[PDB]
Amino acid sequence: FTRIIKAAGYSWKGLRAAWINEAAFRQEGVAVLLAVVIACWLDVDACTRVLLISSVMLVMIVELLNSAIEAVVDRIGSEYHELSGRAKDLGSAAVLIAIIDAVITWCILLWSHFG
Amino acid sequence: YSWKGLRAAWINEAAFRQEGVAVLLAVVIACWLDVDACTRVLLISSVMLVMIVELLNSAIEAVVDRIGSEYHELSGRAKDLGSAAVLIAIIDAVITWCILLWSH
Amino acid sequence: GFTRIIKAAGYSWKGLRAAWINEAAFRQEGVAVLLAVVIACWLDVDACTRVLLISSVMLVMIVELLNSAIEAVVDRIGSEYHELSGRAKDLGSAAVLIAIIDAVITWCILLWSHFG
């Protein structure tokens, strides 16, 4: 079972790292907990609760992966002395799409619920 | 950053153009059918996910290309891995639409 | 070009096979994924519930694949360069963790409403 505790350790190291270093990530965590609270407090069916939570967590996932990519790029540029933000742009685009997905999700779901 | 990368992906990646077309089409079609909110959301999200994953994969490909002009086993592995991730997102999207529309 | 699709699919399967052979976590999570997918196709639930149960778990697959790609990039860099903070690897590990947590939460909320 050791590999599991090692991996989870790496995961918490990463999460704490992202929380301390990235402001947008802190905002996204706030967004997740708020999402759960709102979804559970509102009298809402299971699929919709799930969707309201998942759509927001997806943002966190994509943000983390993006941050990983940014880190790789930064190591490169540190040793490379050449910079092109192609990758960073693409990642940020991905995160944007995730956010738009969450807003659409919440719009449709909450609009239906309060109809 | 954002619109820069999106414009980049549209101009360069063909699969991304096809995915954008697929996304907007999916939006229209999801809004046309008389389905519930959860269904609509799933129909849209499933397609948007493909776009997201394709974008991340494209970022990875960019990094790999920047690292070295020469091809290496690990660099190739990375690309292949990213291509695999995109594949799964598509299958999921397909499965999503199938379960939903068959039920409808 | 219609052939482009089959080329990209070839790359894709090459990557799936690569991930399965080299990455163990991908194998185990793959077992849990396939199990979950099978179970979802036999549960007496609505389309939305089934799609949710399946997709939530396939997300784990996708994120693990991306994490593996990133790890491959870091491993590539580590041959040329000597020091590695492994911060990127940690971030990816975090992403996978969040994906899994999402899957579990999804299954709990869904099945506790279903069976409950």
From Swiss-Prot, chain C:
EC number in record: 2.7.1.107
Cofactor: how and how many bound: Mn(2+), Zn(2+), Cd(2+) and Co(2+) support activity to lesser extents.
Location(s), subcellular: Cell inner membrane
InterPro entries: DAGK, DAGK_prok, DAGK_sf
Topological domain ranges for the Cytoplasmic compartment: 1-25, 64-89
Annotated positions binding ATP: 4, 11, 23, 71, 80-82, 89-90
Chief location: membrane
Temperature dependence: Apoprotein in organic solution has an unusual stability towards heating to 100 degrees Celsius.
Entry keywords, A to Z: ATP-binding, Cell inner membrane, Cell membrane, Kinase, Lipid biosynthesis, Lipid metabolism, Magnesium, Membrane, Metal-binding, Nucleotide-binding, Phospholipid biosynthesis, Phospholipid metabolism, Transferase, Transmembrane, Transmembrane helix
Membrane topology term: Multi-pass membrane protein
Periplasmic side: 43-45, 114-116
Entry keyword Ribonucleoprotein: no
Domain notes per entry: Contains three transmembrane helices and a N-terminal amphiphilic helix located on the cytoplasmic surface. Residues from different subunits participate in forming the active site. Contains three catalytic and substrate-binding sites centred about the membrane/cytosol interface. The gamma-phosphate of the ATP is positioned for direct transfer to the primary hydroxyl of the lipid whose acyl chain is in the membrane. The presence of Trp residues has a clear effect on thermal stability. Of the mutants containing a single Trp residue, only that containing Trp-107 was found to give active protein.
Family: Belongs to the bacterial diacylglycerol kinase family.
Main function: Catalyzes the ATP-dependent phosphorylation of sn-l,2-diacylglycerol (DAG) to phosphatidic acid. Involved in the recycling of diacylglycerol produced as a by-product during membrane-derived oligosaccharide (MDO) biosynthesis. In vitro, phosphorylates various substrates, including sn-1,2-dioleoylglycerol, sn-1,2-dioctanoylglycerol, sn-1,2-dipalmitoylglycerol, sn-1,2-dipalmitate and ceramide. Catalyzes direct phosphoryl transfer from Mg-ATP to diacylglycerol and does not form an enzyme-phosphate intermediate.
Protein name (record): Diacylglycerol kinase
Lineage: Bacteria, Pseudomonadati, Pseudomonadota, Gammaproteobacteria, Enterobacterales
